[PDB]
XYZ file of C-alpha atoms in Angstrom:
717
model
C 0.000 0.000 0.000
C 2.791 2.266 -1.059
C 1.276 5.737 -1.481
C -2.441 6.032 -0.764
C -1.475 9.318 0.729
C -0.945 11.432 -2.390
C -3.426 9.143 -4.134
C -6.647 9.744 -2.254
C -5.809 13.331 -2.917
C -4.722 13.664 -6.561
C -7.351 11.037 -7.469
C -9.590 13.732 -8.977
C -6.853 15.378 -11.017
C -7.592 15.916 -14.689
C -5.514 16.405 -17.787
C -3.142 13.617 -16.920
C -1.010 13.009 -19.938
C -1.235 15.887 -22.400
C -4.125 18.030 -23.600
C -4.211 19.799 -26.949
C -5.359 23.241 -27.960
C -4.206 25.357 -30.860
C -2.653 27.970 -28.573
C -1.037 25.814 -25.916
C -0.851 22.399 -24.293
C -0.781 21.151 -20.706
C 0.953 18.064 -19.316
C 0.168 16.476 -15.961
C 1.715 13.382 -14.398
C 1.758 11.906 -10.908
C 4.855 10.783 -9.006
C 4.918 11.797 -5.332
C 8.127 9.886 -4.756
C 9.961 11.577 -7.607
C 12.333 14.406 -6.863
C 11.747 15.713 -10.392
C 9.723 14.928 -13.485
C 11.130 16.538 -16.628
C 9.253 16.836 -19.906
C 11.279 16.191 -23.061
C 10.056 16.599 -26.644
C 10.860 14.891 -29.951
C 9.710 15.262 -33.555
C 9.280 11.593 -34.535
C 8.049 8.219 -33.393
C 11.650 7.005 -33.464
C 15.134 7.940 -34.618
C 14.518 6.013 -37.858
C 12.579 8.731 -39.675
C 14.092 11.970 -40.936
C 15.242 14.550 -38.396
C 13.742 12.897 -35.302
C 15.344 15.664 -33.234
C 14.508 16.290 -29.647
C 12.994 19.737 -29.178
C 13.775 20.607 -25.562
C 13.346 19.745 -21.913
C 11.141 21.348 -19.282
C 10.895 20.655 -15.559
C 7.368 19.977 -14.403
C 6.218 21.433 -11.078
C 4.990 19.220 -8.249
C 1.755 19.950 -6.420
C 2.442 18.861 -2.862
C -0.993 17.809 -1.650
C -1.573 15.734 -4.782
C 2.054 15.166 -5.704
C 0.953 15.595 -9.306
C 3.504 17.148 -11.616
C 2.108 19.541 -14.212
C 3.364 21.707 -17.046
C 1.737 23.983 -19.602
C 3.318 25.644 -22.628
C 2.129 28.013 -25.335
C 2.620 27.257 -29.009
C 1.298 24.524 -31.277
C 2.917 21.193 -30.425
C 0.616 19.213 -32.723
C 2.329 16.001 -33.843
C 5.391 16.778 -31.772
C 6.775 13.748 -29.927
C 7.696 13.735 -26.254
C 8.613 11.770 -23.138
C 9.129 12.270 -19.411
C 12.317 11.554 -17.527
C 11.252 10.471 -14.027
C 13.736 10.839 -11.160
C 12.919 8.537 -8.231
C 15.303 7.442 -5.467
C 18.077 9.195 -7.385
C 17.560 6.953 -10.407
C 16.260 8.351 -13.684
C 14.235 6.349 -16.207
C 12.565 7.449 -19.453
C 8.892 6.737 -19.351
C 7.378 7.156 -22.827
C 4.185 8.637 -21.419
C 2.027 6.789 -18.925
C -0.906 8.354 -20.789
C 0.026 7.819 -24.449
C -2.814 8.585 -26.837
C -0.538 8.461 -29.892
C 2.796 6.729 -30.201
C 5.893 6.279 -32.242
C 7.265 2.921 -33.330
C 6.665 0.075 -30.863
C 5.671 2.765 -28.355
C 9.141 4.148 -27.657
C 7.634 7.657 -27.672
C 4.395 9.650 -27.627
C 3.162 12.602 -29.705
C 0.447 15.178 -29.034
C -2.369 14.054 -31.309
C -4.619 16.870 -32.482
C -7.312 14.383 -31.730
C -10.213 15.451 -33.955
C -7.922 16.363 -36.857
C -7.103 12.684 -37.359
C -10.716 11.876 -38.147
C -11.285 10.409 -41.634
C -13.768 11.848 -44.073
C -17.300 11.240 -42.845
C -16.130 10.540 -39.304
C -17.783 13.455 -37.518
C -21.133 11.893 -38.430
C -19.998 8.442 -37.359
C -21.992 6.660 -34.668
C -21.278 3.949 -32.156
C -22.740 0.551 -32.951
C -23.927 -0.254 -29.450
C -26.068 -3.283 -28.760
C -29.171 -2.560 -26.710
C -28.804 -5.925 -25.067
C -25.235 -7.012 -24.479
C -26.041 -10.505 -25.737
C -26.982 -9.476 -29.285
C -23.277 -9.538 -30.091
C -21.765 -12.602 -31.759
C -18.128 -11.876 -31.214
C -15.929 -13.028 -34.096
C -12.405 -12.941 -32.622
C -9.981 -12.072 -35.414
C -6.338 -11.226 -35.119
C -6.248 -8.776 -38.019
C -3.185 -10.185 -39.739
C -4.675 -13.680 -39.879
C -7.732 -12.489 -41.795
C -5.711 -10.386 -44.229
C -2.345 -11.872 -45.101
C -3.017 -15.119 -46.964
C -1.772 -14.898 -50.544
C -5.177 -16.024 -51.816
C -6.984 -13.508 -49.617
C -8.090 -11.239 -52.468
C -6.973 -8.328 -50.307
C -4.518 -6.102 -52.134
C -0.795 -6.636 -51.610
C -0.653 -3.332 -49.733
C -3.809 -3.938 -47.711
C -2.695 -7.520 -47.056
C -2.035 -7.612 -43.302
C -3.259 -4.155 -42.346
C -6.277 -2.293 -41.003
C -7.524 -1.297 -44.460
C -7.997 -4.980 -45.203
C -11.232 -4.299 -43.355
C -11.592 -1.394 -45.797
C -10.546 -2.653 -49.227
C -13.749 -2.216 -51.161
C -14.260 -5.588 -52.767
C -12.205 -8.737 -52.967
C -12.547 -12.297 -54.250
C -10.725 -15.545 -53.589
C -7.357 -15.264 -55.375
C -8.194 -11.685 -56.459
C -9.618 -12.777 -59.816
C -12.023 -10.323 -61.428
C -14.437 -13.148 -62.037
C -17.550 -14.974 -61.019
C -15.114 -16.116 -58.323
C -18.133 -16.282 -56.043
C -15.881 -16.458 -52.964
C -15.721 -12.836 -52.009
C -13.126 -12.549 -49.267
C -11.923 -10.071 -46.691
C -14.371 -7.366 -45.685
C -16.899 -8.580 -48.273
C -17.162 -11.901 -46.462
C -18.052 -10.145 -43.219
C -20.922 -8.501 -45.074
C -22.071 -11.795 -46.556
C -21.863 -13.494 -43.175
C -23.122 -10.338 -41.516
C -20.819 -11.229 -38.657
C -22.389 -8.417 -36.617
C -19.504 -7.891 -34.180
C -15.760 -8.173 -34.548
C -13.408 -8.583 -31.658
C -9.954 -7.392 -32.556
C -7.297 -9.392 -30.828
C -5.125 -6.875 -29.070
C -4.847 -3.812 -31.294
C -3.231 -1.551 -28.750
C 0.536 -1.210 -29.030
C 2.232 -4.453 -28.007
C 5.971 -5.103 -27.867
C 6.120 -8.710 -29.054
C 6.097 -7.738 -32.740
C 8.897 -5.689 -34.260
C 7.044 -2.876 -35.997
C 10.292 -1.806 -37.691
C 9.926 -4.704 -40.151
C 7.086 -6.349 -42.010
C 4.944 -8.770 -40.074
C 5.765 -12.274 -41.223
C 6.067 -15.874 -40.098
C 9.095 -14.609 -38.122
C 7.613 -11.290 -36.938
C 4.263 -12.337 -35.493
C 2.637 -12.319 -32.102
C -0.829 -12.447 -30.646
C 0.157 -9.235 -28.886
C -0.489 -10.023 -25.212
C 2.489 -7.833 -24.307
C 0.965 -4.428 -23.616
C 3.311 -1.478 -23.855
C 0.822 1.324 -24.429
C -2.840 0.887 -23.506
C -4.113 4.080 -25.165
C -2.600 3.950 -28.678
C -3.379 1.396 -31.407
C -0.745 -0.882 -32.874
C 1.502 0.613 -35.536
C 2.465 -2.600 -37.309
C -1.079 -2.965 -38.635
C -0.804 0.549 -40.025
C 0.529 1.087 -43.493
C 2.784 3.683 -41.811
C 3.682 2.860 -38.211
C 6.235 5.681 -38.108
C 3.266 8.065 -38.415
C 0.725 8.604 -35.726
C -2.724 9.562 -36.912
C -2.229 7.150 -39.812
C -2.685 4.141 -37.574
C -5.369 6.215 -35.872
C -7.192 7.170 -39.070
C -6.943 3.715 -40.615
C -8.177 2.400 -37.304
C -10.952 4.955 -37.600
C -11.469 3.848 -41.206
C -11.484 0.231 -40.123
C -13.831 1.249 -37.338
C -15.842 3.319 -39.796
C -16.011 0.510 -42.342
C -17.311 -1.808 -39.645
C -19.619 0.892 -38.308
C -20.822 1.605 -41.840
C -21.593 -2.061 -42.287
C -23.355 -1.967 -38.893
C -20.691 -4.216 -37.365
C -19.706 -3.480 -33.767
C -16.015 -3.459 -32.828
C -14.906 -4.947 -29.499
C -11.340 -4.564 -28.262
C -9.217 -7.012 -26.273
C -7.524 -4.900 -23.568
C -4.931 -6.468 -21.309
C -4.559 -4.379 -18.137
C -3.675 -7.213 -15.750
C 0.016 -7.295 -16.694
C 2.538 -5.588 -18.916
C 5.205 -6.861 -21.260
C 8.064 -5.590 -19.140
C 8.984 -5.029 -15.526
C 10.702 -1.883 -16.844
C 7.576 -0.485 -18.480
C 6.856 3.205 -17.934
C 4.802 2.334 -14.840
C 7.810 1.066 -12.911
C 9.853 3.831 -14.508
C 7.401 6.477 -13.291
C 6.494 5.302 -9.764
C 8.867 2.405 -9.056
C 7.175 -0.104 -6.764
C 3.730 1.499 -6.858
C 2.095 0.159 -9.996
C 3.390 -3.420 -9.655
C 2.570 -5.617 -6.707
C 5.687 -6.762 -4.885
C 5.986 -9.369 -2.163
C 9.207 -7.531 -1.360
C 10.913 -4.382 -2.528
C 13.250 -7.023 -3.970
C 10.719 -9.182 -5.780
C 7.620 -8.765 -7.903
C 4.864 -11.271 -7.569
C 3.993 -13.345 -10.616
C 0.297 -14.128 -10.246
C -0.329 -13.588 -13.955
C 2.592 -14.165 -16.226
C 5.790 -12.460 -17.330
C 6.724 -11.653 -13.720
C 4.358 -8.844 -12.756
C 0.935 -7.892 -11.478
C -0.543 -4.440 -11.987
C -1.356 -2.762 -8.681
C -5.071 -2.556 -9.589
C -5.772 -2.249 -5.876
C -3.900 1.050 -5.695
C -5.629 4.267 -6.585
C -3.411 5.847 -9.199
C -3.839 2.675 -11.232
C -7.578 2.459 -10.670
C -7.787 5.917 -12.199
C -5.521 5.074 -15.157
C -7.785 2.193 -16.140
C -10.963 4.167 -15.538
C -9.853 7.097 -17.683
C -8.321 4.867 -20.358
C -11.224 2.538 -21.167
C -13.245 5.729 -21.370
C -10.693 7.182 -23.801
C -11.061 4.358 -26.336
C -14.832 4.671 -26.031
C -14.676 8.467 -26.220
C -12.603 8.673 -29.396
C -12.302 5.447 -31.406
C -15.952 4.643 -30.624
C -14.885 1.168 -29.490
C -18.000 -0.736 -28.516
C -16.580 -2.961 -25.786
C -13.593 -4.140 -23.792
C -12.469 -7.715 -23.149
C -9.990 -7.997 -20.243
C -7.268 -10.586 -20.026
C -7.058 -12.235 -16.584
C -9.431 -9.928 -14.704
C -8.670 -12.052 -11.663
C -5.511 -10.009 -11.106
C -7.511 -6.771 -10.886
C -9.366 -5.863 -7.742
C -13.139 -5.858 -8.175
C -13.184 -2.385 -6.632
C -11.530 -1.264 -9.878
C -13.710 -3.114 -12.383
C -16.722 -1.685 -10.590
C -15.409 1.831 -11.166
C -14.556 1.387 -14.862
C -18.045 -0.005 -15.420
C -19.505 2.878 -13.439
C -17.279 5.388 -15.243
C -18.462 4.241 -18.680
C -22.075 4.511 -17.574
C -21.572 8.281 -17.357
C -19.429 9.058 -20.403
C -22.368 9.990 -22.659
C -25.157 12.180 -21.329
C -27.824 9.884 -22.773
C -26.354 6.936 -20.845
C -25.674 5.047 -24.074
C -22.247 4.285 -22.629
C -24.113 1.842 -20.414
C -24.450 -0.284 -23.561
C -20.688 -0.728 -24.109
C -19.782 -4.374 -23.494
C -17.187 -5.308 -20.877
C -15.869 -8.762 -19.944
C -12.731 -10.822 -19.460
C -10.980 -13.931 -18.143
C -11.764 -14.404 -14.420
C -8.985 -16.900 -13.657
C -5.609 -15.776 -12.403
C -2.325 -16.546 -14.128
C -0.454 -17.684 -11.036
C -0.247 -16.955 -7.328
C -2.288 -13.762 -7.163
C -0.540 -11.459 -4.730
C -3.666 -9.952 -3.112
C -6.792 -11.430 -1.614
C -9.456 -9.506 -3.566
C -9.708 -10.869 -7.078
C -12.134 -10.798 -9.969
C -12.772 -14.502 -9.555
C -15.761 -16.514 -10.647
C -16.439 -17.126 -6.956
C -16.355 -13.437 -6.003
C -18.425 -12.714 -9.107
C -21.404 -11.354 -7.187
C -19.342 -8.265 -6.301
C -18.779 -7.203 -9.909
C -21.313 -4.905 -11.477
C -23.898 -6.962 -13.413
C -22.455 -5.753 -16.738
C -18.839 -6.828 -16.366
C -18.383 -10.307 -17.817
C -16.240 -13.404 -17.397
C -15.185 -16.240 -19.641
C -16.590 -19.549 -18.406
C -13.913 -22.235 -18.671
C -16.000 -24.823 -16.831
C -18.306 -24.518 -19.821
C -15.582 -24.506 -22.497
C -13.787 -27.600 -21.203
C -16.991 -29.591 -20.982
C -17.783 -28.865 -24.632
C -14.419 -29.777 -26.136
C -12.277 -31.153 -23.301
C -8.968 -29.763 -22.143
C -7.632 -26.805 -24.077
C -4.718 -28.923 -25.119
C -4.845 -32.673 -24.648
C -6.410 -35.214 -26.941
C -8.938 -35.874 -24.168
C -12.306 -35.883 -25.900
C -14.966 -33.466 -24.755
C -18.683 -33.574 -25.422
C -18.449 -32.579 -29.085
C -16.181 -35.561 -29.791
C -18.443 -37.869 -27.782
C -17.312 -37.597 -24.168
C -20.764 -38.101 -22.677
C -19.539 -37.285 -19.186
C -19.159 -33.592 -19.931
C -22.747 -33.367 -21.182
C -24.136 -32.486 -17.769
C -21.727 -29.574 -17.430
C -22.329 -28.269 -20.949
C -26.093 -28.358 -20.439
C -25.684 -26.214 -17.332
C -23.347 -23.883 -19.215
C -26.123 -23.187 -21.723
C -28.074 -21.657 -18.855
C -25.249 -19.136 -18.662
C -24.754 -19.861 -14.951
C -21.695 -22.031 -15.420
C -20.646 -20.022 -12.400
C -22.731 -17.765 -10.191
C -23.533 -14.803 -12.422
C -26.030 -11.964 -12.313
C -26.849 -11.162 -15.954
C -26.153 -12.700 -19.363
C -23.890 -9.733 -19.943
C -21.522 -11.690 -17.680
C -21.043 -15.200 -19.064
C -18.888 -15.212 -22.216
C -20.147 -18.594 -23.357
C -17.195 -19.673 -25.491
C -15.589 -22.833 -26.854
C -12.325 -21.654 -28.323
C -9.759 -18.898 -28.529
C -6.396 -18.014 -29.962
C -4.929 -19.857 -26.984
C -4.270 -23.594 -27.274
C -6.027 -25.658 -29.951
C -8.145 -23.721 -32.368
C -11.433 -25.594 -32.427
C -10.730 -27.509 -35.630
C -7.240 -28.594 -34.602
C -8.537 -30.114 -31.369
C -11.499 -31.646 -33.198
C -9.138 -33.417 -35.582
C -6.422 -33.933 -32.961
C -8.954 -35.217 -30.439
C -10.636 -37.392 -33.034
C -7.161 -38.817 -33.306
C -5.017 -37.455 -36.139
C -2.809 -34.464 -36.876
C -3.285 -31.346 -38.993
C -5.093 -33.325 -41.635
C -6.842 -30.475 -43.445
C -9.391 -33.253 -43.666
C -12.561 -32.804 -45.667
C -14.187 -35.516 -43.547
C -17.920 -34.944 -43.383
C -17.589 -36.281 -39.850
C -14.954 -33.855 -38.580
C -16.235 -31.037 -40.780
C -19.686 -31.889 -39.440
C -18.168 -31.820 -35.959
C -17.191 -28.134 -35.836
C -20.813 -27.270 -36.594
C -21.643 -28.716 -33.173
C -19.811 -25.886 -31.411
C -21.501 -23.143 -33.401
C -24.802 -24.860 -32.704
C -24.039 -24.517 -29.003
C -22.317 -21.138 -28.646
C -24.501 -19.031 -30.933
C -27.560 -20.472 -29.186
C -26.303 -20.179 -25.614
C -27.279 -17.237 -23.455
C -24.646 -14.598 -22.912
C -22.166 -13.301 -25.424
C -21.371 -16.006 -27.998
C -17.731 -16.109 -29.003
C -15.745 -17.555 -31.875
C -12.156 -17.597 -33.063
C -12.058 -16.053 -36.516
C -12.719 -18.605 -39.224
C -13.803 -21.352 -36.893
C -16.819 -21.251 -39.255
C -14.668 -22.524 -42.105
C -12.488 -24.812 -39.996
C -9.493 -22.531 -39.766
C -6.583 -24.799 -38.895
C -3.229 -24.257 -37.235
C -2.128 -27.825 -37.976
C -2.257 -28.910 -34.329
C -0.267 -25.998 -32.910
C -1.188 -25.261 -29.283
C 0.628 -22.193 -27.971
C 0.710 -20.758 -31.481
C 1.399 -17.314 -30.102
C 4.323 -16.729 -32.485
C 3.922 -19.600 -34.956
C 4.567 -19.126 -38.669
C 2.100 -17.407 -40.966
C 1.559 -20.807 -42.563
C 0.254 -21.804 -39.146
C -1.373 -18.427 -38.430
C -3.183 -17.366 -41.570
C -6.682 -17.836 -42.887
C -6.165 -19.792 -46.084
C -9.354 -18.472 -47.645
C -9.585 -21.447 -50.000
C -10.891 -23.149 -46.891
C -13.927 -20.900 -47.286
C -14.724 -22.679 -50.531
C -13.581 -26.077 -49.301
C -15.334 -25.512 -45.971
C -18.235 -23.794 -47.543
C -21.518 -25.078 -46.185
C -19.834 -24.753 -42.805
C -19.706 -20.978 -43.153
C -23.080 -20.978 -44.902
C -24.342 -22.958 -41.934
C -22.624 -20.475 -39.610
C -24.117 -17.402 -41.301
C -27.508 -19.062 -41.052
C -27.261 -19.224 -37.268
C -26.570 -15.489 -36.975
C -29.761 -14.966 -38.957
C -31.420 -17.098 -36.283
C -29.791 -15.308 -33.358
C -29.975 -11.652 -34.345
C -33.693 -12.017 -35.151
C -34.420 -13.785 -31.844
C -34.413 -11.641 -28.708
C -34.330 -14.497 -26.128
C -30.935 -15.636 -27.394
C -29.904 -12.004 -27.040
C -31.949 -10.477 -24.194
C -30.146 -8.121 -21.818
C -31.371 -9.861 -18.673
C -31.340 -13.625 -18.305
C -33.807 -15.747 -20.096
C -33.386 -19.433 -19.356
C -33.625 -22.481 -21.624
C -35.599 -25.480 -20.620
C -33.703 -28.710 -21.182
C -34.837 -32.010 -22.628
C -31.536 -33.845 -22.408
C -28.366 -32.902 -20.549
C -26.466 -36.182 -20.244
C -25.063 -38.820 -22.509
C -24.470 -37.636 -26.053
C -27.381 -35.251 -26.762
C -27.930 -31.868 -25.135
C -31.275 -30.314 -25.987
C -32.870 -27.118 -24.734
C -35.512 -24.605 -25.793
C -35.795 -20.822 -25.536
C -39.131 -19.130 -24.954
C -40.368 -15.761 -26.187
C -43.469 -13.577 -26.096
C -42.844 -11.143 -28.969
C -45.233 -11.339 -31.913
C -42.702 -10.430 -34.638
C -40.376 -13.372 -33.891
C -40.518 -17.126 -34.269
C -41.637 -17.923 -30.743
C -40.080 -21.024 -29.199
C -36.719 -22.257 -30.494
C -35.189 -25.677 -29.859
C -31.511 -26.532 -30.329
C -30.057 -30.045 -30.374
C -26.366 -30.962 -30.549
C -25.414 -34.623 -30.924
C -22.057 -35.523 -29.405
C -21.867 -38.794 -31.324
C -19.806 -38.888 -34.475
C -21.924 -41.784 -35.683
C -25.281 -42.269 -33.992
C -28.621 -40.621 -34.723
C -30.534 -40.506 -31.451
C -34.241 -39.599 -31.610
C -34.823 -36.751 -29.155
C -38.004 -35.573 -27.498
C -38.552 -31.863 -28.017
C -40.172 -28.905 -26.354
C -43.390 -28.661 -28.380
C -45.747 -30.297 -30.814
C -44.724 -28.598 -34.061
C -41.468 -27.320 -35.491
C -39.798 -25.976 -38.603
C -36.236 -27.107 -39.261
C -33.976 -24.117 -39.882
C -30.630 -25.890 -39.626
C -29.669 -29.444 -40.538
C -25.890 -29.484 -39.997
C -25.354 -28.604 -43.665
C -27.148 -25.276 -44.002
C -28.957 -22.787 -41.803
C -30.702 -19.439 -41.726
C -34.114 -17.994 -42.059
C -35.258 -19.955 -45.103
C -37.117 -23.115 -44.154
C -34.955 -26.178 -44.702
C -37.800 -28.428 -43.565
C -40.829 -28.803 -41.351
C -41.109 -31.513 -38.728
C -44.076 -32.594 -36.660
C -44.788 -34.559 -33.517
C -42.912 -34.483 -30.250
C -39.574 -35.830 -31.525
C -36.619 -34.957 -33.741
C -33.529 -36.847 -34.892
C -30.067 -35.314 -34.581
C -28.058 -37.204 -37.231
C -24.447 -37.853 -36.215
C -22.503 -34.574 -35.891
C -25.517 -32.486 -36.871
C -26.295 -29.423 -34.795
C -29.925 -28.721 -35.685
C -32.210 -25.765 -34.923
C -35.997 -25.969 -34.748
C -38.451 -23.101 -34.335
C -42.104 -23.404 -33.418
C -43.674 -23.920 -36.800
C -46.958 -22.089 -36.167
C -45.028 -18.813 -35.822
C -42.112 -19.257 -38.213
C -43.493 -16.503 -40.463
C -43.335 -13.729 -37.856
C -39.739 -12.996 -38.855
C -40.760 -10.781 -41.782
C -37.286 -9.374 -42.395
C -36.535 -8.437 -45.955
C -33.727 -10.200 -47.711
C -30.372 -8.589 -47.064
C -30.652 -7.049 -50.522
C -26.993 -6.185 -50.961
C -26.056 -3.257 -53.117
C -22.835 -2.860 -55.012
C -20.040 -0.502 -55.807
C -18.404 -0.973 -59.197
C -15.014 0.654 -58.867
C -13.579 0.958 -62.375
C -10.191 2.555 -61.815
C -8.946 4.452 -64.862
C -5.718 6.436 -65.071
C -6.088 7.615 -68.661
C -7.550 6.515 -71.990
C -10.390 4.615 -70.339
C -9.899 0.849 -70.292
C -9.783 -0.870 -66.871
C -7.049 -0.927 -64.230
C -9.140 -2.836 -61.667
C -12.759 -3.866 -61.143
C -13.805 -4.752 -57.631
C -17.499 -4.954 -56.783
C -18.147 -4.352 -53.083
C -21.304 -6.132 -51.906
C -22.529 -3.632 -49.297
C -25.745 -4.313 -47.440
C -28.813 -2.220 -48.222
C -27.920 0.359 -45.581
C -24.357 1.301 -44.684
C -22.482 3.604 -47.077
C -20.635 3.023 -50.364
C -17.454 4.757 -49.166
C -14.548 3.982 -51.499
C -10.885 4.632 -51.859
C -7.810 5.114 -54.176
C -5.603 2.261 -52.911
C -4.185 0.875 -56.179
C -1.410 2.988 -57.731
C -0.016 3.909 -54.371
C 3.471 2.485 -53.718
C 5.026 4.839 -56.215
C 3.148 5.685 -59.388
C 1.989 8.221 -61.933
C -1.194 6.361 -62.908
C -3.669 8.634 -61.125
C -7.086 10.131 -61.834
C -9.441 12.826 -60.551
C -11.723 10.202 -58.952
C -14.806 11.519 -60.678
C -17.887 9.712 -59.377
C -20.369 9.612 -56.511
C -17.663 8.442 -54.052
C -19.898 8.047 -50.991
C -23.402 7.862 -49.612
C -25.918 5.415 -48.228
C -26.014 2.308 -50.383
C -29.417 1.528 -51.763
C -29.977 -2.141 -52.579
C -29.345 -3.583 -56.014
C -27.571 -0.601 -57.544
C -24.119 0.122 -58.955
C -22.208 3.096 -57.613
C -19.235 4.109 -59.723
C -15.993 5.830 -58.850
C -13.209 6.314 -61.400
C -10.427 6.358 -58.818
C -6.773 6.053 -59.796
């Protein structure tokens, strides 16, 4: 409890970090133990770029009762870089900035972002894509590079691997201007209507060298936080340049917002990459728990725990998670290993969001994380599943007890339910209730089967079924992944999904793939054709879910169950709305082989999934009190007497028809973005861009709400 004096006071300070105005800027930073905090300025994100000079140094002034150090200067410091030197116990360490809204390369430095100036065209009229209920999400966890970088990805060679791969207008499998009906990249998200992305950690992490291209030898998942408040540079086209990463992120955000897709961010406050992070550099021995002034505790990983208990961290979280929601319009935050944090900090972040926007919309922003610790947690108050009743109802927890029962161990061959381990069935059936541990609202339980960590769902499915990496087309194993989606997307509480699980993304059996080669960590999009039907089946379930409030209500509903043990789990949702199907029944057969006849919730049903295909269009009626779940099939039934209530229109996609022309007509490229009926046909020059002369006025309509089956033309490039 190092310094709660000077942190009860100083808790309400404001303008920590730096604040921008055209005339002048103010810096404030807190270090009661320091003898001096000195501001130092730079002109670049690193010494790589041209000039990169420092600009000058300025001693901040301590405020005794708060200990906060502050400085204000006149002049425009827009896009100037800077750092603090912190002097504590006679040592001096350079601290980047504790509050770093915009960063150089890898984070080494910060620059004063003229925040609103970064905004892309048509940003000021952007909107959040909040979900009224938390559960209406369907989080598709993608690590951006994986989605983009495959050679066959259709994404342009300069958008390949980068934020604008969510922004490249229109793209087909192997790029061919063709009836190559496999649209890929951002187009696929529109076809699937994936509804909500989760970006694997897009804040600045140290475990990728941003100085060089990301590659099979320059990859990481990015669980090595270095700056919480600035997005990753490596996914920029231009990491050396702040704003760029910011704008592209805003354009990636805006492209997902345009398409009505919510963006959720994995944020990893429980630990940092380095015991010599800015935190320890700025208040050594405050921010990190320490069983001794000699020795950090290690209750998480990598040798540290953030001092969540201790006020001047509680603030930093509270007014960081707000920052991402303030600016980037991020729609939710997923916390790694919440169990390290004190609940009396999660409760404040939750409560701080609830007041960001005057209309209370901030209440809608999703928040959840992993409740388990990563080791011997150093303090007694922890975000555990057991303590869960002390979190605010709208902070959520992954539910491993559920996960493991579905699939088994994260890692071993040991078969779970999906592969036929009957003896998990009882635990999975309870997990579908959402109360796999004591929880207060569906906003809590992140019903999930799979993640980046350990075996991607397919690899375990094949590995657990008994063979390695096979890329197998087996209608058994390929039928077997559809079990999980049948469960998760029909559970209560936020469904979750590693990106491309829906086309059997494989990592060839790799467990801790955290830095494994691109050939291990890429979406080979030819799997989308090969494991078509699977994705078509997957899309069809989101049609089911998004149109079905009980699967997505804000407070708990609760399935009935008709089998919970052996090899068939079967449960039914209930509803009272008149413009929705009414009762839904979901059955998942753990067998790989057998076709058990199941009793079901009511006397008449329409089949809307069969383990091959799914979604609103009737795949078959069925009648009488029983249904058969053939082999791997995950099947969905809705009460047949009210199947018609879902009078949604078809997702009548519209189109852009970019026809880039430099001069003399002809064609330089022809994408055809497949935008949904709403959204906007925003469109971009990204062809002749490395170095070129082939350039055009970009005559055309260039932007606006799309309109259904209509062709919007821009003559870019």
